[model samples]
Target: MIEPVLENVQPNSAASKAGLQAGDRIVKVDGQPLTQWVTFVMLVRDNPGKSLALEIERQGSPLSLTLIPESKPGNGKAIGFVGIEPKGKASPV
Candidate 1:
């Protein structure tokens, strides 16, 4: 399974405020396993203003972070924004 790894984190954003940095590999969300980048995006986008517990691996050490996504306007609705992008070649679907 391909885990969602952080390629970059925006300054002053939700992820950055939560201390998420580049190269951190997300292992789980809300205690559930995360293997797809798309799923991560969907969860974040769907839960604006909600706190999410993220389990990540940083430099081979496990860490936990709490993220509350910012609410933003989407396609006629509000969506969550974390201001982080995943690593690797896959693009948003």
Candidate 2:
């Protein structure tokens, strides 16, 4: 399964500096399976200010990412959030 909650490695931010990526599909966090996006988000939000060992699937290949999410300043702000789309353009469905 895929997770809806995705984040960027922030171009040089903590996670980015730690080596995260946009296409990294998180399969596990802190040794727990990341079943879906929502679950990932919940896990991230729940465990604030900690590093997560991310197991991801990159373009059908497996990879591992070290990530630590830092809360944003505002009530609903974040250092990284999902604002990207999959690489290929749309085709006939």
Query: Candidate 2 lDDT, tens digit per residue, 1-92?
Result: 44433343345455566565676666677777755545555555555467777776767786777666665443564443222222334110
Model 2 spans > 4 angstroms off: 3-9, 74-93
Q: Which ten residues in a row have the lowest lDDT in candidate 1?
A: 84-93
* Sequence-dependent TM-score of model 1: 0.91
Q: Give the lDDT of residue 62 in candidate 1.
A: 96
Please give the lDDT score at residue 48 for candidate 1.
95
Judged by whole-model lDDT over C-alpha atoms, candidate 1 comes out at 0.86
**Model 1, C-alpha of 52: deviation from truth (Å):** 0.5
